[PDB]
Amino acid sequence: VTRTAAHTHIKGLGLDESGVAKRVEGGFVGQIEAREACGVIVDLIKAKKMSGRAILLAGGPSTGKTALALAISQELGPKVPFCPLVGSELYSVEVKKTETLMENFRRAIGLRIKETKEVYEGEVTELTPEDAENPLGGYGKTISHVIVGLKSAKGTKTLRLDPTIYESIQREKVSIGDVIYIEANTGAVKRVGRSDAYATEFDLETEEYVPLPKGEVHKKKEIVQDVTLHDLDVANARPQGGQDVISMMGQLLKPKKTEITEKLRQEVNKVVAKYIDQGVAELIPGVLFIDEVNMLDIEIFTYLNKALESNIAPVVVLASNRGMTTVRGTEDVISPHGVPPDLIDRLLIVRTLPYDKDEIRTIIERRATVERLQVESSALDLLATMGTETSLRYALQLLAPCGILAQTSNRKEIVVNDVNEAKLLFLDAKRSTKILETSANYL
Amino acid sequence: SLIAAHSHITGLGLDENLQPRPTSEGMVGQLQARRAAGVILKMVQNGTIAGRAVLVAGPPSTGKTALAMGVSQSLGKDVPFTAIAGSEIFSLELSKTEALTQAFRKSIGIKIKEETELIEGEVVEIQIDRSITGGHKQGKLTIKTTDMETIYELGNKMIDGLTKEKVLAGDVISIDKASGKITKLGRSFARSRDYDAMGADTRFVQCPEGELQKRKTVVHTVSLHEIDVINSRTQGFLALFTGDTGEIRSEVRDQINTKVAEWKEEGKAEIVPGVLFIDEVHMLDIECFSFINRALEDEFAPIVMMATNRGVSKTRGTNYKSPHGLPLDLLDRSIIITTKSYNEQEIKTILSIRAQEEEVELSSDALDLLTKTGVETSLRYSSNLISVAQQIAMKRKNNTVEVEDVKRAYLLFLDSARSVKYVQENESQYIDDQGNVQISIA
Amino acid sequence: IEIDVLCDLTQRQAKLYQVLKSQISTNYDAIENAATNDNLINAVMQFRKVCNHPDLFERADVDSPFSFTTFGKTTSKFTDLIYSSRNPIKYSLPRLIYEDLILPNYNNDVDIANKLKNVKFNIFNPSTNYELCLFLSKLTGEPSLNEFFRVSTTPLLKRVIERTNGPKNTDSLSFKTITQELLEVTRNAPSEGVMASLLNVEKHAYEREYLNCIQRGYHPNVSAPPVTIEVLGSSHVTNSINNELFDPLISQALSDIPAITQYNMHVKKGIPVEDFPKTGLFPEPLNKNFSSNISMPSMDRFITESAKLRKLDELLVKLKSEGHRVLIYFQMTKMMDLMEEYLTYRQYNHIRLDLVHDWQTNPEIFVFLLSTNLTAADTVIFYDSDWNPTIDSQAMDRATRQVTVYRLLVRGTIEERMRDR
């Protein structure tokens, strides 16, 4: 019914009120100390006071680091922005990697503003233009002003327009008898559709039909809106939504990331500080998750060394599989987890332990219950032995072919013959490696 | 169309019990790999499982790409199958992660339901009011069948579609209201007043009967990447064809994910998954492997099929060697289907299937020598030699292809080992690796 | 005689649930036990308000980008509307910079050096470089030798707007490429022709994919005008900025002329058609849905926002043939939502809180909503997911000699705990 994909079983960190964790709750099994550390981190995050904090989720492969990051995001909520990332995603061909990292830093910080909108909406009853006395004078436009008549429900008003607002009106291609929506904040117009008071069974353009808008014209309504600071930086660097010629030409041109200067970010900070001082906007700091942080070179770590010192920079969590591994982009500097020792001092390493046999067994059982598979006890034990023998992920990813073989053999339960056939058909890494070492023609 | 190297596969050749026949649907042998590919096919057809990587491995000239195209033919209609190679990821305007994400979002599909009105009748009159400069276009249409006659108002796009495919009165046209199609089925009046300018000779059609407007419901398939380019900029439809989709932002992706979830919950749209096939996967970089590792674990992620013919070799972008050229963390997430080399009977059956497809008739002894040559050097060499033996036979003005023809073809065209033995004996003739050569005869 | 229906949770419902779960916290298991036994009670009512309808929490108004604008706002015959949007970021430049480096002055050399670099030392100047102009007039085939000097000294977008040229010398080196021949063929050509249909496949893909009726998925989050430059004490800056932002040639180019103004211009004032300023050069958007970033709240989407409401509307679709009544129960403010629902989309006979006996005498009417003897009703539809079965018994004290109880329930919430206990 519902599409499952990878660690969908996680519903949260599964902690208690005192700050402790139960063994099997919240979709997790084990890793009690890592769970409690991430709970203290998410409490620090909800405190909304510190900036430029960083932790590291260290450990081997297939150990639960990305699971812990997803659990943190689910414990945080939708209003707090979670910005997932991979280390390889910072290498863009349009713009330097430093600006991509700073754009992600600004993308993590959220904002929630209540906004007041001045709205003229209604049905266009009349629409007359007034020409100029010298239409080919070269200066000014071919019309002078335009009178338009809008009636909402239980109201009627006549509007006299300057040529720019009517230029937007005719760019949205209104006609007599259409329901329109003038936003006086930007001059943007939205054509709602034909009024349904007239006959609605004769058009040939699949037009929607809408009743009269309730209330008077010249409404003033309050909208709550959730935006990030990166949205403000992008919207000011590529200005669209105005009605001048720069905003009109900005829509049609090809978008391209540019190195946003520090002056724009400082001006956006001053404006958001004014919005906060007005009491209309609140600051919501969030997270940024660089999975596979070993993929970054030394230059991104050098820029992080300064970008964590900002007064607005969020809390950033990292993951790494490496042990004593040389840093990418350097020649002889060998460091733990592929992370240079300057960044390790700002970091707070959260270790993550490997699993046991029974923990693997209950993880496989929970994955079978998530995927709506029914498994007998003997096949579950055999899959647990296979997990401890080959790998955990090879045991988790073998449940689906046993399900396919089960519905092939007109059964729902997974017998031992099904997991034996799935062992035969699909190989793990080690058996395929032994096949590689015992072949001549580079199989 | 033309005939290609994998044209003989017309499916995968398995039963309802997922048991392969010895030779069915143009495929022979490879029983375990065929059964495993059928299992992965049924797992795709279920659709509730997402982001599972399947790695096909074996020696060259075995049928890994043949197995992949067999899965593609058995995949059915309206299911995406993005078949790229390893080197399309590297680009000058796209990042590697962005090109991979574009491939991933091409491979997954959305089936959208729409409501459509069908109008078909004779045209009584057309009145079109265009402005002085021709910009604003508005007017009325009066279409008619034998039971009732209705008048519609026209918009700009319908009138512009009316100007092309010029519609005189008394022309039976079909109007699709949603798609905006105009289909002149013919002319039904055949008026005596005929214009000497116009050269149309549209066929006479019967007057339509029944009601004028007919409601129908249609379904069409569009991938996630197409809607991403469409919503990315104003002229996204042109960038769908010219490929000028330069690094679409993440906000667009988040909003289209929420939107297609909303369309799923309304019953309007249905999300079907697909198979993303990479050929020569070892050509990728290590950062591509890390992004594949962290992008298989997403809700919208297809069943990635991965093919390599390489043993333990150096992984690109790194200084070490790894099995299949793939690092161990990607091999952890991937289940490996292995393939095995053929015997003389399977090679004979392959060559017989190839000759039966390629419209070439062979004798028994020519087939035996082709089987022996195929089991000697390579299967692809004999499969290529069928063509030149056919052409030599038609140059000798005989319908069949004889043993002498394939012997002349074997003498005429060289294979790998013979060309190696001819290079090694004449090392002064060709340019060496140090760039030293003797072009003079003496 | 006994029906209990169960509904899942939509995405907006799940989003509101998960933000309430993360924000309030306060032992959600103990909050579940609080909803079992019945501030804590304010949390339980607000969780139930999330469970019933998103619009019972907050009304979903228009989805528009954040207007990063400062403008003329009312603090509260015609009232004229004038465009006044400005960027709140104001870049301040002193007058010394503008009047000394940008404008002409007696002690400045900007006009002199500008003429000397643009006209006097231009290589396309026919007065001093006639041989090069004649060379390029042989190559390109321009009929006028001043075309090269005019082209090299115009802004490029103004060159785009003023480009309409049809005479060309036939004894020139400018060529008609095979692609240009094919483009001149498919300038105007109908269907059923091979040479046009092999080159019009973009329109075939547009037509066959039903792509003119795909809804908009993405809108920008913040829309902002260009950064306003403010120079204190000079009106020349204001006039120059007003000229740059609102250039009449270019603003006339991206727009259209009203048809009445075209008729009054061409016929009444005798302006020839070629003398009109160029119009209609704005690119056509993909559908009508992609015309603007403001999205109107679809009333069709209001049904699908709440899963209980969607199942109820499906149930009414099945049950229009028979007469029943509906209980909205203990929740306030759900009345006006359901009221607006059936008087906005699907108009039904109804009565909402004598006239009770007046509907009891009327068989064809469906009662719909009531709050918390009525045996004339044939079927009561209600929730049964209430803490007090005494409230249930008082509700079914109302109760035609038939009952068919349908019980509305949402899964994956505190409602299931309520039902179990």
Partner: peptide, 28 residues
């Protein structure tokens, strides 16, 4: 009852008219 048709404004523009018998073009 039956709803009225939308008001069709045809002032100020040329007319191309095609009918069953013969074709017209009223221009300005």
């Amino acid at each position: 009852f039956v709803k009225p048709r939308r008001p069709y404004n045809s002032e100020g523009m040329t007319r191309i008219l095609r009918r069953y018998e013969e074709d017209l073009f009223c221009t300005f």
